[PDB]
Every structure is written in structure tokens, then in C-alpha cells.
Amino acid sequence: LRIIWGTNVSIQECTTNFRNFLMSFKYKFRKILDERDEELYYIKQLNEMRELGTSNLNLDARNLLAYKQTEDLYHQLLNYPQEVISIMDQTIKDCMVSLIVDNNLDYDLDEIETKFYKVRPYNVGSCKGMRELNPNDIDKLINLKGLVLRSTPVIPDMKVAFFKCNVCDHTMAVEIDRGVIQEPARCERIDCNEPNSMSLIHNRCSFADKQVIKLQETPDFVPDGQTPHSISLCVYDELVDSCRAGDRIEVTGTFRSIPIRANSRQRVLKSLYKTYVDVVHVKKVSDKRLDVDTSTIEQELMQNKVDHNEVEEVRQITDQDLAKIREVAAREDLYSLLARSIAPSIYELEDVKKGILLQLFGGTNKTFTKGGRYRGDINILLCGDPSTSKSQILQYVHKITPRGVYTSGKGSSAVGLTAYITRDVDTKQLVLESGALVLSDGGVCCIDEFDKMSDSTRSVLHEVMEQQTISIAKAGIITTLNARSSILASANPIGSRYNPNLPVTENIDLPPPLLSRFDLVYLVLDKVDEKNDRELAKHLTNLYLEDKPEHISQDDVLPVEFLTMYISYAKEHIHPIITEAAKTELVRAYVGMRKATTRQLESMIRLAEAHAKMKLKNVVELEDVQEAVRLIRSAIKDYAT
Amino acid sequence: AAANPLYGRYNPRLSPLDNINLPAALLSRFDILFLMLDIPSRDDDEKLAEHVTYVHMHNKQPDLDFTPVEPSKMREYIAYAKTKRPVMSEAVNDYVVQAYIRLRQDSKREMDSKFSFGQATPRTLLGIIRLSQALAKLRLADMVDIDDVEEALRLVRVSKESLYQ
Numbered sequence A: 001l002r003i004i005w006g007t008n009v010s011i012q013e014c015t016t017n018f019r020n021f022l023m024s025f026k027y028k029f030r031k032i033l034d035e036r037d038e039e040l041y042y043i044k045q046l047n048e049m050r051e052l053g054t055s056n057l058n059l060d061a062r063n064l065l066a067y068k069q070t071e072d073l074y075h076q077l078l079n080y081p082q083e084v085i086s087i088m089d090q091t092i093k094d095c096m097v098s099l100i101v102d103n104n105l106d107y108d109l110d111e112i113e114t115k116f117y118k119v120r121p122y123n124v125g126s127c128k129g130m131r132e133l134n135p136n137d138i139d140k141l142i143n144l145k146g147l148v149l150r151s152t153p154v155i156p157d158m159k160v161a162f163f164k165c166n167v168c169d170h171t172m173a174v175e176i177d178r179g180v181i182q183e184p185a186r187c188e189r190i191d192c193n194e195p196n197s198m199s200l201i202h203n204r205c206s207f208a209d210k211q212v213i214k215l216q217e218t219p220d221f222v223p224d225g226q227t228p229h230s231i232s233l234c235v236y237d238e239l240v241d242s243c244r245a246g247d248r249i250e251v252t253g254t255f256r257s258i259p260i261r262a263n264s265r266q267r268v269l270k271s272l273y274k275t276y277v278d279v280v281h282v283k284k285v286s287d288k289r290l291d292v293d294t295s296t297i298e299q300e301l302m303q304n305k306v307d308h309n310e311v312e313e314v315r316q317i318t319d320q321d322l323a324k325i326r327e328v329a330a331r332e333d334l335y336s337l338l339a340r341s342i343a344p345s346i347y348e349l350e351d352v353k354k355g356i357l358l359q360l361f362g363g364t365n366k367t368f369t370k371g372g373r374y375r376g377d378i379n380i381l382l383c384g385d386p387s388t389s390k391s392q393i394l395q396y397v398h399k400i401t402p403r404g405v406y407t408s409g410k411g412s413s414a415v416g417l418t419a420y421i422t423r424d425v426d427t428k429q430l431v432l433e434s435g436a437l438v439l440s441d442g443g444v445c446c447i448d449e450f451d452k453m454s455d456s457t458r459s460v461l462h463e464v465m466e467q468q469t470i471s472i473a474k475a476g477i478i479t480t481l482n483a484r485s486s487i488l489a490s491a492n493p494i495g496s497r498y499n500p501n502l503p504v505t506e507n508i509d510l511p512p513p514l515l516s517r518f519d520l521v522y523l524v525l526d527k528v529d530e531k532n533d534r535e536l537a538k539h540l541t542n543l544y545l546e547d548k549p550e551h552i553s554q555d556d557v558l559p560v561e562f563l564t565m566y567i568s569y570a571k572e573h574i575h576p577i578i579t580e581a582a583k584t585e586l587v588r589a590y591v592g593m594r595k596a597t598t599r600q601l602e603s604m605i606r607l608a609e610a611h612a613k614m615k616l617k618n619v620v621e622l623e624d625v626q627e628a629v630r631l632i633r634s635a636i637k638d639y640a641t
Numbered sequence B: 001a002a003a004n005p006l007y008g009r010y011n012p013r014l015s016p017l018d019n020i021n022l023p024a025a026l027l028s029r030f031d032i033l034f035l036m037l038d039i040p041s042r043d044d045d046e047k048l049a050e051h052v053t054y055v056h057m058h059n060k061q062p063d064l065d066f067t068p069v070e071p072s073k074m075r076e077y078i079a080y081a082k083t084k085r086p087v088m089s090e091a092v093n094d095y096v097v098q099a100y101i102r103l104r105q106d107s108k109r110e111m112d113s114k115f116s117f118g119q120a121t122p123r124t125l126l127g128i129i130r131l132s133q134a135l136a137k138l139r140l141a142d143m144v145d146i147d148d149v150e151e152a153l154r155l156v157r158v159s160k161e162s163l164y165q
């Protein structure tokens, strides 16, 4: 028996126990874990990796918890990760080689002899963020759910130091040991001695990449009393430029502590330690929220290859899923199936839900190879009575969209919608933080009490609503920066309730041009009657029949986890061409409004093409304009007044 | 919230949407408003003047066949009631609906003149449910009766019957 000091770990006993698992696992969690075909569950993923060069082994930690023989290990790597992962680095290499020697094989040997393999363990239990992390939790595996507010520049950090000798033509190198460079005073005596004369040469040395990232942390529960924490965390090589401002994330790593120097003068250290996460894995995506625009992020999809990391950017889907997607797309009522399943707790309002669905698809994005750009979006406003979906819709969008800041009222003004300059107290320098719209370079920016935002603030959106960019000239920065956000707005009329005896253009209390530059405006007036509000009341109270609404599967609707897999396919993979035959029905629909401005026309093409992203059509057909124009007219009840 | 009309006291010649300065969108987020306003009277002011002079003659509260509960024990009782998560019977479910439609039909079709205020809304139906849950929790009861909502609706309506005095 052998054991590490301060530790419960036996190297060889864990080594064989990990191999025993690694050569025998087959989804036993489905059998054992709870009340929930395949084989060799990891061996396929290991013999997958060796031809791709993707040296990373992403590990679902809960494989071990359910499995019969490595409950003895889950509570070790969780509690001793720096050492237990150092074992896995070795065992996996030996467990790759066992798949060599059992194989008649080509020369994989000549590199995997030398190359290095690693593990990223992420699928661990939940925690109350920074707050529950009492000092007993120091140096343990942890995970955090949250988002990024800023990231520092890449920092050079020493890994081999170099020494140049002022005489006698021999240098020296030393590898760093646990944070020190033990510089030899002696001139490597056996050449000759001079007592103290040697140099240290910066540009000969070998460096790691380091990067630091600031995480706004958002627990699944927070105690009454709390407020958001800006954690500071560090990420090493192969994760630098993995994740960046506005991303919504699950990240895992080791919780740490470190001292701080009191001053730049002397080595007195503060005893009240600082704390951070050393990141080991980041889960860039989730099943519940859709996928970041592949056209926008095109610069980084290749950087992941060029940087040699497979930390994933886009949802993987199998043929069994795509086959279902296509078999679903053939049905006649998809146009209403999504518009119901988008909000299974929201009653009727299917004109609203449907145009919102057509916002999420975006439509089409296009450029002229230098001189111009156009993008698929519709910018939306909701108006009419209180006591309606308006505020709840802004949540469901927010909780599906991977990006977006729920701005609100007078609590949101120019310096914090666009970027601002601020003192980073942790280092005391001026640094630039992305504002709300800049963080929202994609997805949706969701705005509420839109008319109670001031006359001064509204003037930023007045550019952004179609030009999708913001341009700056204030001290320290002069740039135009991207603001690809779609915009969605909740508004209420002048006075209160609604008043049909005054024209809507006045009633909204929003200026005629900005109201026009919205692509779709919804009038959501109540107009009360029996045989609607009764059916609504039954629907609502069924949420209190069963104290959690698991029977909401009634009135059949898609699983959200499939709907997001559909949209993040259609969005990613279809570029719907507006056919030259579609013009003839399109222009008359515009001119019929003129008997109002091009924003309607520029909206209809961006809305109708989304109605071709839906149903996955590479080309627009004369029918799909017809539903799009009717939607515009009926969204403002154009027949009535 | 405590608030006062535009002239401190009410004016009976002003409809409440004009007597009250607040906008009805914000007001619709109050699940109950109380028109807790005074009118002089020969009798009722006498018992008040007793209670105030009694409680000013000494700290003690009136000699009713009652005791005013010590607050800390009431806090413990509330903390137990908070643990209760009551469920609505289908019997009351269909009653809440029909009362709501009669309220909403009356509120709209009749009550948009003179003393009439506001409109009935989904939010006021949810108010009645939350109040009906609260009553059942004060019973320490795992279910919500038809006997609860017929009390909850009373508090909703009674808060403005003061206006007719």
C-alpha cells in the first residue's frame, strides 16, 4: 500500500480502477441513476479522437457516480483534482497505447509516445456560486453558471526561463518550479566561476498564454439579502478566446486562494486572501437556449481549429435528430405548431408569438464584399392594454436567447447602453467595458417601459434600429462597433388602458418616424368578452390544479429541447433567396399601403424570408409573402380604422 | 403603500380615476386598493374617542373578552403557515371563473360612468387566487375551499363600498 501525504489516493490502485472503468462502461446511469442499445461507450469516443488530433477528453463526471466500481473515485477527483487529474494524464496515454498494441496499425506510435493527453471534468453538482464556498472548499472542483462582463488581454507567463552569461560563452535554462525561478549565482562553475555576473534574457524564454475573465455569477438560488458578485477567474492556454462578453455559460475549475502584495515597495502580504477560479472546462452551450449566429462568429470557428482546441462552439446533432426534423417539417401546421409551443402557458396571441418566432429565425444576412451589409431581423413593439403577455414574453425570449440584457425604463441610459470607461479597482487602471447593446451583439435586446425611457436616451436606438451599429467619439476611444442586436420593445399608450376614439399614431405617444422604423408593431387591445376570458381563466387555474404543471403536455406541443434544435439548425443552414417572381405580389402590397415608408418593404423581405427559414426553403415562393403581409396588417388591426 | 388624493381629502364630484392621480396601469398592479376615507358621524366617532382616550389614559388596550396576541408568537405562527402550499378544488375553480366573468362583464359593460373605476383583469383573478391561497394557509389547510374565495371577493369589493358613505 502506497499513499500520498495528506491524501487518500493510491496511484496504482486508482490507475487500475480507472482502466477497469475505461474498458467497461455502457450507459449504466440510464439503468441505475434514476427512473430513466449502445456499447463500449467511451472506446468509440477514444478511437474517435486519435485520428482527429483533438487531444482533449471531455468527461461526463457522473458516469462514475452511477457506475458500480468508481464511486470510490468521484469524491477523490472532486476533492483532489490537481493530483487526480495528474494521474489521468498518464493512465489515458497508457490506455491509448493498449489500443495500439492490440491493433495492427500504422505509425501512430511516433508522436503519441511524446504528445500529452488531458481531461476536462465538467458535469459536477450545483453550488451557490461564490457564497457557499467556505474555506473548507479551497482547492476543490467547482462549477459556476453565469455570464462574462469583461476579459483582459493575454498575459505572458514564464514556463522556461533563460540565462545569458556575460562572459565565457555558455548560457543556461531552468524550468520553473511551483512559482519560482531559482537563478544560479555560480556561473556554472565547471566552465569557470565568476561570482555574480550572469544575465536573464527575456526574449529567449518560453511562455504560457494566460488570460483573466470577469464573471457575473447567477446562481439557481440566491439567499434573501444577496447582490450580484463579479468573480474574477483565470483561464490558461487552449481556452484563451474560448468565451467572451455576453456569453451565458457553465464553467468549471478549481476554487483557489492567493495573497496580494500590499504595495509595489516591499513583500508584505495581506492576510485576508483573495479568491478566484482556475478554469479547467467551460460548457459554451446548452440544450435549452439556441446557438450563437454562425455567420457572425465565423472568425472564431476557424480559430478553434487554428488554435487546436475542440471546446465546442455549436450544438452537435445526430442523423436520428435531423431525420426527425425533416419529417416534422413536412407537416401542414408547423406554422402554428411552433407558434403554440413557443409559449405553452400563454393564451391565444398567436399573431404575436408567430412574428416573434420569425424574429428568432432572423431571416437572411448579406454583404457586398467590401462596401455594404444588410441583415435579417425584425424590430418589434408591443402596445395596448396592461394585464397581458408583454412582460412574460420578454422573459421567455430572454431565457431562450443566448444573449441579451433586459433593459428597463429610466434605469437605462446612454453611458450604459453603449460602452463606458471605468477604473478597474483590482489593478487601478482605466479599462473599457461593453455596454448593454454591445454585449447584445447578436440574439435579442429586450426593452421594456419603452416610452418611459427619456428623450435623450432614445436617440441611440434611433440609429441602431436598422443601421445595427454604434459610432463613438469620446475620450480614449474613437470607433464604430458592431451592434447586431434585434430589438424588442414593450410599450403602453398615452394616459392608460386604451382609447379607440383617438388615432393610434397619437395614442401610442411615440413619434411617427421611430414608430415607422419599427418593422412590426403589435396592437394587443383587450376588447373583453365571455367565451374568451372564460377559456383563459380555465387555462390559468389549471396551473394551480397540480402544484407543478407537469400535465401541461396536454394540447400537444413540441419539447423545447427539440424546438431549439430545429431553430438552431434552420438559422444556421439555410440562406433563403428572394426569387425574382416574388416581386410582383410584393410591390403591390407596398403600394397598397401608400394610397408608411420603405421600412415596411425592407421589413416584409426580412419577415417573408424568415417564413422560408421556417419550412427550410432555400428559395422564397409566391405564397410566403401572402402570410407575411397579412400579419403586418392584422398586427395593427388595419381593417378596423 | 400609503397615498393621499389630489386635495388631501376626496372630492365626491370627481370620479376616482380623476380623484386619484395615479395611472391605472400602475394601479392595476395593486391587487387591492383601500379607499380608506373618513366621513363625520354622530355615533361612530364616540367609540373612537373612547379608545384613544383610554389608550392615552394608559398604555393598556380595551377590556374586551379578548387578548391582543404578542407579536413574536404571531411571527412564529406565520412562519409555520408560510410552509403550506395549498391546492385549488375543481368546485371552486369553476366558481372563481364564473364570478370573474360576472365581475368583468359588470365592470366593463355597466361600470364605466360616474363612480365607476378601472377594469377587471386577469391580474385581479390571480389576486383572488393568491388571496384564496393565503386564507387556506391561515387555516393551515392543504386545500382551498369554495368557502375561501367567497371571502376573498368580499375584501376586493368592500375596499370601495366606503365610497358610497
Ligand SMILES: Nc1ncnc2c1ncn2[C@@H]1O[C@H](COP(=O)(O)OP(=O)(O)O)[C@@H](O)[C@H]1O
Residues within 6 Å of the ligand: A345, A346, A347, A348, A385, A386, A387, A388, A389, A390, A391, A392, A536, B122, B123
Ligand atoms: N392571455 C393571457 N395568457 C396567459 N397569461 C396571461 C394572459 N393575460 C395575462 N396573463 C398573466 O398576467 C401576467 C402578465 O402581467 P403583464 O400584463 O405582463 O404586465 P403588463 O400589464 O405590464 O404587461 C402574467 O403572469 C400572465 O401569466
Ligand SMILES: [Zn+2]
Residues within 6 Å of the ligand: A165, A166, A167, A168, A169, A187, A192, A194
Ligand atoms: Zn561566465
